[PDB]
From a paper:
In the case of the glutaredoxin that is the focus of this study, glutaredoxin A from the cyanobacterium Synechocystis sp. As part of the thioredoxin superfamily, glutaredoxin A shares the characteristic thioredoxin fold. Our random mutagenesis approach has yielded four new crystal structures of glutaredoxin A, one for each of the following variants: R27L, A75I, A79S, and P84R.
These replacements are located at the extreme C-terminus of the protein in α-helix 4, and both are exposed to the outside surface of the helix. Neither is involved in crystal packing interactions nor core packing interactions, and therefore, these positions are predicted to be highly tolerant of modification. However, in the case of the A79S mutant, there are minor structural changes observed in the geometry of α-helix 4. There is a measurable decrease in the twist of the helix, a decrease in the helix-bending angle of α-helix 4. The R27L crystal structure lacks two neighbors; the A75I and A79S mutant have no net differences, while the P84R mutant adds three possible interactions.
Author numbering: -10 to 88
The structure:
Amino acid sequence: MRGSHHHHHHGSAVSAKIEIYTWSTCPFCMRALALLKRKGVEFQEYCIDGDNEAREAMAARANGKRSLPQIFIDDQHIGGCDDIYALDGSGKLDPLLHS
C-alpha cells in the first residue's frame, strides 16, 4: 500500500451523493448541469426524457414537484436550477458538495 495516505477514521470512503433529474434538452436542466460540471464534482444524472414513471418517482422525492430539474445532495432536496444557483451565489453550495 505504497502512497501518501490520508487518515481520519473514514473507514469505508464515501463522498457527497449528488443527483439531478433532467430532460437533456431542457435549458434550465442544461444550465444546472453546467454549474455542477464546472465545480468538477462527481454526480449522477437521471435523464428521464419522455419517461413518465421516473417523473412520478422524482415527484415522490421532491415535495410532489414535477418541474425540471430536481436536485438532491446527500438525500436532501435542493430544488431546481434557480435554487442551486441561488445557493451558489450566496456561497452556500460548495460546503454542501462538500467543499
